[PDB]
Symmetry: D2
Subunit: 344 residues, 4 copies
Amino acid sequence: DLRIKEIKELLPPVALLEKFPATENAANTVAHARKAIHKILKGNDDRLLVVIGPCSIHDPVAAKEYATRLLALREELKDELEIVMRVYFEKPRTTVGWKGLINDPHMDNSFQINDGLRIARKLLLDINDSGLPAAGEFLDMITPQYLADLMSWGAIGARTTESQVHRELASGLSCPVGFKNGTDGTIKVAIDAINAAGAPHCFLSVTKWGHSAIVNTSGNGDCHIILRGGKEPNYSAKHVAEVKEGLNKAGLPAQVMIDFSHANSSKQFKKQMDVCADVCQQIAGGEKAIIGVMVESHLVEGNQSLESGEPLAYGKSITDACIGWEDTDALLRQLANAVKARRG
Amino acid sequence: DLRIKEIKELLPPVALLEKFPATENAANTVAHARKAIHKILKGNDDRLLVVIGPCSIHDPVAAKEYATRLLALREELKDELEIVMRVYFEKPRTTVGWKGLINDPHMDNSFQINDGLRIARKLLLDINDSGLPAAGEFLDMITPQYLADLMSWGAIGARTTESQVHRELASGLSCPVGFKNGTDGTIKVAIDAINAAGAPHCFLSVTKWGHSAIVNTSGNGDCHIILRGGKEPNYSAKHVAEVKEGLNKAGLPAQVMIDFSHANQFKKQMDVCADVCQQIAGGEKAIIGVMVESHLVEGNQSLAYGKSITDACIGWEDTDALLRQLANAVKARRG
Amino acid sequence: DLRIKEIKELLPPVALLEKFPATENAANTVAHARKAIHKILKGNDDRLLVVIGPCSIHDPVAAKEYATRLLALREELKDELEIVMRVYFEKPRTTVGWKGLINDPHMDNSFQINDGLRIARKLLLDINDSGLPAAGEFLDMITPQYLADLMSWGAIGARTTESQVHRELASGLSCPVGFKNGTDGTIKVAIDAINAAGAPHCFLSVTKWGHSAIVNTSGNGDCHIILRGGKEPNYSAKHVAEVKEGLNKAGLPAQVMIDFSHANSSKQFKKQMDVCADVCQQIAGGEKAIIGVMVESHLVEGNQSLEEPLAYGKSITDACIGWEDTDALLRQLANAVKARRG
Amino acid sequence: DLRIKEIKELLPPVALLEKFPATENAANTVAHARKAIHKILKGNDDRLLVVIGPCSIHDPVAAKEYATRLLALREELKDELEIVMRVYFEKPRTTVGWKGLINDPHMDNSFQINDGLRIARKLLLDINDSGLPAAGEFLDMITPQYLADLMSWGAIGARTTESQVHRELASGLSCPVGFKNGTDGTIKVAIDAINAAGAPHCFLSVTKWGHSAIVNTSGNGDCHIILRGGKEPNYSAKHVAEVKEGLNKAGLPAQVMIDFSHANSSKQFKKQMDVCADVCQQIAGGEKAIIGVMVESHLVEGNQSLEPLAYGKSITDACIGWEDTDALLRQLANAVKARR
């Protein structure tokens, strides 16, 4: 072990669960959102799932201010939308970079992961206790045990949709999971992933006591695809139509979540408003297959760099660029209006 | 934990290491091979690394005969080739299927992963102890702790080359590592992986004691690309030139390993060997290694002895020819 | 595994330290107290260490009211007494009924040990945050990792004083530890235990992470004898002198703590007051070896059996004295400390 | 905290059990011995149990020689005696002192407990694999998981017979256990111990994986008292009657094992030969209640202190040499023959 520089102690998940148990209302928020997404996935509800919020969490203060604003819109629009806040603690990097709040909460390569786990779970508890469900991307294999009970929906990243260990992880998650199409636009990897995840697996994992063990999962049937573009955007009716047939062809429900960001906006954050307009016209025109959308959204639009010394502006993303609150409130009302027109 | 059915006990790595310690022979085998591959990658040895063996190990018996047959050609062609056995204990699947000897040693959905780890560590030690180095595919984040000390070279599968968790594992592995290109011929995901895996990382992983912990890695500079083609073969001297440019454009050594199988019909590996031999004989010093899928008996099955139950492989006769063709192509590149 | 019926999961100590972290006030209560007992055992303080409290805790609510009352007397008599609340959770018992608060918090043989450890640590935390130092009995090797950070003083049983495993534990404890004389009143085992615990040791223990490990102790020099009788009481001046001699002969400070209960009170709770009277006479007369006293005390006197509502503030284990006798005993002990000074 | 100097890593019992597993032979040796001693404690075999061997194992070579010699008299004096060897890896000290092979195998205060466990298991494994049953004093709470599967009979020391944790340990031990009388001679403590051990207990312990857990035991019936004297010996048919009186009074089988050593030997290893005569007369006299005996025997008699040390001699309590050992075993084999 000459490439392993140092080994440090890591709190077991039981300690984080004991320090920060779920309140009654937080468990109620998680259980009700999970069930509401299941019902949307089963076709038994015509509301739209909206996973929306910052590309990454770096500030518990801005996240909770964002959560309050979003929760007010969640209550107002709840006949049309099942609104779930992006509470992403883990970021996959193209090569190297800040991996998110849990890996480095102080954002300075001190890698205080025990503190990161504490900060993240407390935040998740606070947000669920307020009544707002949370979504996360499941990237690490060990962190889920610290946080999954407060997660109402999860995503597997486009760069890990093919990874067996991530499909194994999804097959044991207690929440619904969405799988992104390939970074080049390929639909087949995600379809395979949905099927892999619907099956039981047996593999090595870590328990809530921090020990490795042999686990057996039952398969997760609440899995679905996320369209995030490839070389070109793939949100348009022609692409929805192709995905639907590909899914049916493989014996899976013909339903999609559409990500407005990333490749579907050509990496231009304000173009998420142009995807909303085409998606809203599709829904308002009667497309039932669109069961969810994803939007990268913060208090203040744009982004900033930790590298730049310029002091960090408040409520502004340090990873990908996000739309700001004004566009977020207007975007959500557009989606609600389209769900309602689809219905009448 | 609704979708979790059962949790069973798993032997800590420290246990299989105490039951099956590396002999002084195995340690020297792993060490010399790692150092030899490092020298080949620094460009201070004109020999070619040959990673050859079955697609998946399933019978320790057939596997030990192969290791003996291959050890003879190893000592014979050592002035030209650094020969390493493919001992693959973790198998990646497109959706569902057998994941290897570790996940289900009895191959019967009993998942005796504790026995699987015993059979695997014993075979690798025996192979290394004889003097034959060993190669594996690192797919799982936990199993490496049981075997990596007997590993001289490792491969990250094409499905996980873009994964941060696999790039973190590579950054701390004591063996040199090869990243395969994308299931569509892309070299960028592999160049990004080599750069990621060369940087230091901090992440969560299970220790030899079976407990989760925070690890810091130093970075792995012994990483290189593996050309496995995509929709079309990428082994020709045209594609090689493109990859070398990409690596220079990306500030990486212009060295490559060509996987003769898959995108690049088991027999076609012999044609790729000719193409590759010609490139090497012609003076291509960038092909620093190759990988071939070989077994005692050629073919595949869904049980014959020395025959693959995974991907189809070349038999031994074509393997002795492949190896001499390479050792000849090598001497041409020297004189 | 023939005689092992079931193995269940146990919360690692790190989990209870994470849920119930020491407050700054609690840590100051533990630090200051441990330091005050050290000054008394080194002859640099003339005050008496009084470990007083219930035989066992079964109700955190009555424990906290008791703690509040004792806290008031702790401050009023601080110039004469270092008052430490007895927070024990179980009565060691060949032939057994209730197995303690940690073992069986719900008093129904359900053995919700994880619940017990939670209840136990929260109680200790709350008592130390108030400013009342706490004392416990170390009976097992595993539970101390979950509570010793909030213990200012510890006792090793008389059925365990001859145990190397208990002497090893005490060698690593951060709190002063008292060893009890033999069930036969003999002081040889208690002297052997002080010498062993003052020595450095290496032994197998469980860590804060709930894993077995090799530990090395510095040895503990704040260990002392506890006189609790044998077949007959051993609190009399005759007995103290006979113990003070054996101690000096053995190279240990001639100092004792006297347990007013059990054999020294003929198993009659009210006689703890007759022992207080004899000890207060020895002290006010000048005796300086008596550094401490151990008294079994609750809100309400006597005892009760577990079966249905129970009486508040009354021991469910051994019979204790009530508050009135407790306030008077504490004032008697203080007034004697005042006289010993001259 | 302050009184903890260093915490170091410790192999879990699962690692010692995988590197040094039990051979079929070793397993049979342990299984048979346990069943035999049980039949003896049920009163279905007139034979006598003989716990014989060094006070402490400190040299696996001298130990394997002793074992070869003893395995002979076991298969010869086998119709009258059940010979089990004392393989003690851990020793109680009056205050401070070497704690045995596991705590300090190199007797240098290096405290290489991980090496000590490896050495100990391989020996016990070897001795059992040769066919010789084994015995030890269970003093540590954590070591039993590494060794107990190769133990055919155990003992709880006199200074620990009163310990709750020790009585809990015996309640779950898969082998018969003996409880030494109290250091002063008190027999009650060992009667209470026998009664606790037969009952079920729920307590905290460490698993085979080195992890603390909540364990439930089933209670152990195969427990019995060990007479070791006190301020004065307690092996006279007089005492034996007083003890059986108490055992019956407590509903306990009126059975005893006599340790011919320690305070019963007034700390002079030679008196073990004297105690043997008294005990053997009682057995020829018809005493059916003496089911076992414990003897301290090494290849070379006497004791040595802890640079180089002498072979065959104890570094702990002084023992009887092989010569006296073979004679003693044949004495016992004789008295049993008469009792029949």
